Design a protein around this motif. Sequence first.
Motif, short mmCIF file in Angstrom:
data_model
loop_
_atom_site.label_atom_id
_atom_site.label_comp_id
_atom_site.label_asym_id
_atom_site.label_seq_id
_atom_site.Cartn_x
_atom_site.Cartn_y
_atom_site.Cartn_z
N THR A 14 -11.93 6.24 -2.96
CA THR A 14 -11.38 6.93 -4.13
C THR A 14 -12.29 7.07 -5.37
O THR A 14 -12.31 8.14 -5.96
CB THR A 14 -10.10 6.23 -4.54
N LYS A 33 0.80 -1.22 0.00
CA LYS A 33 0.00 0.00 0.00
C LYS A 33 0.83 1.28 0.00
O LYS A 33 0.26 2.36 -0.11
CB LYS A 33 -0.94 0.00 1.20
N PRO A 34 2.15 1.19 0.17
CA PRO A 34 2.90 2.41 -0.11
C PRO A 34 2.91 2.71 -1.61
O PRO A 34 2.58 3.84 -1.99
CB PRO A 34 4.32 2.29 0.42
N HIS A 74 -1.04 3.30 -3.03
CA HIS A 74 -1.58 4.64 -2.86
C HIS A 74 -0.87 5.66 -3.74
O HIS A 74 -1.36 6.79 -3.87
CB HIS A 74 -1.50 5.06 -1.40
N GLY A 130 -9.13 2.78 7.83
CA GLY A 130 -8.71 4.07 7.33
C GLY A 130 -8.30 4.03 5.87
O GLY A 130 -9.02 4.54 5.01
N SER A 131 -7.22 3.30 5.56
CA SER A 131 -6.49 3.52 4.32
C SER A 131 -7.14 2.84 3.12
O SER A 131 -7.28 3.45 2.05
CB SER A 131 -5.05 3.05 4.47
N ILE A 132 -7.50 1.56 3.24
CA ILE A 132 -8.16 0.93 2.10
C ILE A 132 -9.57 1.44 1.96
O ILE A 132 -10.09 1.54 0.84
CB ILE A 132 -8.15 -0.59 2.25
N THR A 133 -10.22 1.82 3.06
CA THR A 133 -11.37 2.69 2.87
C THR A 133 -10.96 3.95 2.13
O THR A 133 -11.49 4.21 1.05
CB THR A 133 -12.01 3.03 4.20
N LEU A 134 -9.96 4.69 2.64
CA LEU A 134 -9.40 5.78 1.86
C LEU A 134 -9.00 5.33 0.46
O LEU A 134 -8.96 6.14 -0.46
CB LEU A 134 -8.20 6.38 2.58
N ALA A 135 -8.69 4.04 0.28
CA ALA A 135 -8.49 3.52 -1.07
C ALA A 135 -9.82 3.22 -1.74
O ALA A 135 -9.98 3.48 -2.94
CB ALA A 135 -7.61 2.28 -1.04
N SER A 140 -6.70 0.32 10.16
CA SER A 140 -5.81 1.19 9.39
C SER A 140 -6.25 1.22 7.94
O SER A 140 -6.25 2.28 7.31
CB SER A 140 -4.37 0.72 9.51
N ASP A 141 -6.63 0.07 7.39
CA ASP A 141 -7.19 0.07 6.05
C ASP A 141 -8.70 0.24 6.08
O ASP A 141 -9.32 0.45 5.03
CB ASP A 141 -6.82 -1.20 5.31
#
Length: 309
Positions: free
Chosen positions: A285, A247-248, A251, A277-282, A274-275
């Motif tokens: 998108t 995921k670095p 993203h 957070g981040s994979i949701t943030l992914a 965290s995902d």
Amino acid sequence: VAALRACLILTTQREPKEMQKPQWYRHTFEEAEKGFDETLAKEKGMNRDDRIHGALLILNELVRISSMEGERLREEMEEITQQQLVHDKYCKDLMGFGTKPRHITPFTSFQAVQPQQSNALVGLLGYSSHQGLMGFGTSPSPAKSTLVESRCCRDLMEEKFDQVCQWVLKCRNSKNSLIQMTILNLLPRLAAFRPSAFTDTQYLQDTMNHVLSCVKVLYDLSRQIPQLKKDIQDGLLKMLSLVLMHKPLRHPGMPKGLAHQLASPGLTTLPEASDVGSITLALRTLGSFEFEGHSLTQFVRHCADHFLN
């Protein structure tokens, strides 16, 4: 070489269903001109069929003769021949051959050594020196850019279940050559077995070094394609820097990274808070937006993390 270019005008153009009598008599002369001289047409003229059976009594010999020695044929033609040994209805025409494609392995022919065992590899080849023919090479172990020819052998080169002393040698041996240079190569040991056992004493050690490969194409493929060798169950850790160095670059741009980075993980540990957070943030998108991808999303798309997801 008329018989070489004349017959494949039918091979590339193959026509069905209409003639019951004639095509059966059109399939023989294809096969028929394989049985002599002409190493190429020894590898050319049975090939397709491959759909359909070939099971008539005369092409049996075209099966026989070209499941017989079979060399030759040739070195590079032994590649087609490698899988031209039919399946599975021929018991003898397979196992009796396994020595010769493995004789390419057993001695000389540095290519037919490196080349051939990438083929069957499904199926089996339970003969002992042929089992050990997949067990002579693990101490090759592999050098010299020929890795594409061998390191992808070693895994599917293995049989089951007879014994893993001729399987796990890779874990003892094939874990030596990959960590040292040969960058696109650390695929070729580590992305293989892969069903099964990849993580073992030395070869999960290289699950570090196969993952140490990750450098953010190579800077596309190695990211995700090395999550194929993400494998069970030993190391939960590295999958996390493979979640991080998954995921670095994910993203970052090249969401075709995610085209193969999402269908991995999918087992496991991405969809953490965290995902969340981040994979949701992914997945906030939400994209990118492309159709196979739109399905490749749904190919992946998971839950229960949210309704909103």
